[PDB]
């Protein structure tokens, strides 16, 4: 019986996280007033929302991320420094309009590469902005292809992973644990790895990368088992096979070896210092292109050049530095193999792996005695 309610209860809380019919119409507003804002601030405003509302892998209540571009946008001047200086009046200029149009709690932080956060003033939504976060968009765009394969499948067993994660938490970034995107990507390899996802093998973008066009035409003719098409109309069917895949997650990471192994879902299971070979390759590429686009806007400029040799070195070991691949956890960004797992403290594994072996514990070797409200028991921290 024990299994059984459990199922019920977790298909349960999947469900009441799920946004109501009109969300599209509400994010699509969030979207035009936030170029409202952008279109004071900037010229030409671009707006794209990323992130748990593209995906769909959200609540109503989730956290936006939005990126903002404008005339004469580049993704490879950033880093340098004359152009980060002109990305900050931009952000300035944008948190000031921000605040005038009702946005709550608006927050400037200066940086070399700025963002502004607020809640919005009408949904209550975080709001985190940011110029030029094209990875984060193709990223939205790829997970949302994978939602729609099968939404409630995917969704319920995604849902469900962050919910456990952030009750116990796994999930915490303020706490050195892991971000919901990266538990994400660990859940979805292990779908891989079940034959219940395609592993995106071919990345065909121009720095090696994988692209929203590459998952789409590999997710279009993916195969589910047959059964999966008798589970759209019963949640204690489709509850059964997401409680198998919980199952599956839980053990996968209790016992992953991390000393050799990384998180991918181009290569499920690739070595670290093949990631690493990876990594480098990428970067090769990357620093091409980026000095290549400097020089492009020195000669449009004249005045910010000559090119700073030490500026882009200092950009190039920037992105050395998203990247590493001796960290506790490497979890790859299949969109610009950014290891998203890399701030996550040494100190904070016992945790991490602990937790696991208590979810693999009371999903497996307790079955008999599931409760919901204990396995998903919010951490006394």
Same mark, same amino acid.
């Given at each position: 019986?024990? &299994? *059984?309610?459990?199922?019920? =209860? !977790?298909? @349960?809380?999947?469900? #009441?996280?799920?946004?109501?019919?009109?969300?599209? $119409?509400?994010?699509?507003?969030?979207? &035009? *007033?936030?170029?409202?804002? =952008? !279109?004071? @601030?900037?010229?030409? #405003?671009?707006?794209?929302?990323?992130?748990?509302? $593209?995906?769909?892998?959200?609540?109503?209540?989730?956290?936006?991320?939005?990126?903002?571009?404008?005339?004469?946008?580049?993704?490879?001047?950033?880093?340098?420094?004359? $152009?980060?200086?002109?990305?900050?009046?931009?952000?300035?200029?944008?948190?000031?309009?921000?605040?005038?149009?009702?946005?709550?709690?608006?927050?400037?932080?200066?940086?070399?590469?700025?963002?502004?956060?607020?809640?919005?003033?009408?949904?209550?939504?975080?709001?985190?902005?940011?110029?030029?976060?094209?990875?984060?968009?193709?990223?939205?765009?790829?997970?949302?292809?994978?939602?729609?394969?099968?939404?409630?499948?995917?969704?319920?067993?995604?849902?469900?992973?962050?919910?456990?994660?952030?009750?116990?938490?796994?999930?915490?970034?303020?706490?050195?644990?892991?971000?919901?995107?990266?538990?994400?990507?660990?859940?979805?390899?292990?779908?891989?790895?079940?034959?219940?996802?395609?592993?995106?093998?071919?990345?065909?973008?121009?720095?090696?990368?994988?692209?929203?066009?590459?998952?789409?035409?590999?997710?279009?003719?993916?195969?589910?088992?047959?059964?999966?098409?008798?589970?759209?109309?019963?949640?204690?069917?489709?509850?059964?096979?997401?409680?198998?895949?919980?199952?599956?997650?839980?053990?996968?990471?209790?016992?992953?070896?991390?000393?050799?192994?990384?998180?991918?879902?181009?290569?499920?299971?690739?070595?670290?210092?093949?990631?690493?070979?990876?990594?480098?390759?990428?970067?090769?590429?990357?620093?091409?292109?980026?000095?290549?686009?400097?020089?492009?806007?020195?000669?449009?400029?004249?005045?910010?050049?000559?090119?700073?040799?030490?500026?882009?070195?200092?950009?190039?070991?920037?992105?050395?530095?998203?990247?590493?691949?001796?960290?506790?956890?490497?979890?790859?960004?299949?969109?610009?193999?950014?290891?998203?797992?890399?701030?996550?403290?040494?100190?904070?594994?016992?945790?991490?792996?602990?937790?696991?072996?208590?979810?693999?514990?009371?999903?497996?070797?307790?079955?008999?005695?599931?409760?919901?409200?204990?396995?998903?028991?919010?951490?006394?921290?």
């Amino acid at each position: 019986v024990a &299994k *059984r309610e459990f199922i019920r =209860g !977790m298909m @349960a809380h999947y469900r #009441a996280s799920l946004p109501p019919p009109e969300h599209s $119409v509400v994010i699509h507003e969030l979207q &035009k *007033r936030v170029l409202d804002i =952008g !279109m004071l @601030a900037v010229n030409k #405003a671009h707006v794209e929302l990323f992130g748990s509302h $593209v995906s769909g892998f959200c609540t109503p209540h989730s956290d936006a991320d939005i990126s903002l571009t404008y005339r004469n946008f580049s993704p490879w001047l950033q880093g340098m420094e004359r $152009v980060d200086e002109q990305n900050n009046k931009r952000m300035t200029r944008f948190g000031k309009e921000a605040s005038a149009m009702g946005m709550e709690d608006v927050r400037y932080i200066r940086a070399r590469i700025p963002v502004v956060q607020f809640t919005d003033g009408v949904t209550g939504i975080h709001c985190d902005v940011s110029i030029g976060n094209i990875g984060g968009v193709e990223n939205s765009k790829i997970l949302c292809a994978i939602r729609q394969v099968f939404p409630d499948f995917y969704g319920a067993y995604i849902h469900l992973v962050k919910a456990w994660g952030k009750a116990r938490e796994v999930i915490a970034p303020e706490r050195s644990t892991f971000n919901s995107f990266t538990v994400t990507t660990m859940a979805l390899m292990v779908l891989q790895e079940l034959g219940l996802l395609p592993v995106f093998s071919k990345p065909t973008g121009e720095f090696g990368e994988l692209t929203v066009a590459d998952a789409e035409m590999l997710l279009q003719e993916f195969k589910l088992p047959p059964i999966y098409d008798s589970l759209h109309d019963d949640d204690e069917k489709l509850g059964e096979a997401v409680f198998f895949c919980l199952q599956r997650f839980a053990e996968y990471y209790a016992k992953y070896d991390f000393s050799a192994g990384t998180v991918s879902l181009i290569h499920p299971r690739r070595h670290r210092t093949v990631y690493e070979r990876v990594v480098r390759r990428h970067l090769e590429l990357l620093g091409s292109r980026k000095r290549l686009e400097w020089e492009k806007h020195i000669a449009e400029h004249k005045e910010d050049g000559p090119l700073d040799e030490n500026d882009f070195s200092a950009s190039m070991q920037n992105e050395t530095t998203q990247r590493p691949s001796n960290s506790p956890y490497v979890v790859e960004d299949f969109v610009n193999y950014v290891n998203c797992g890399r701030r996550v403290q040494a100190s904070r594994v016992r945790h991490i792996q602990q937790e696991f072996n208590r979810l693999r514990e009371m999903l497996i070797d307790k079955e008999s005695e599931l409760k919901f409200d204990e396995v998903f028991r919010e951490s006394d921290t």
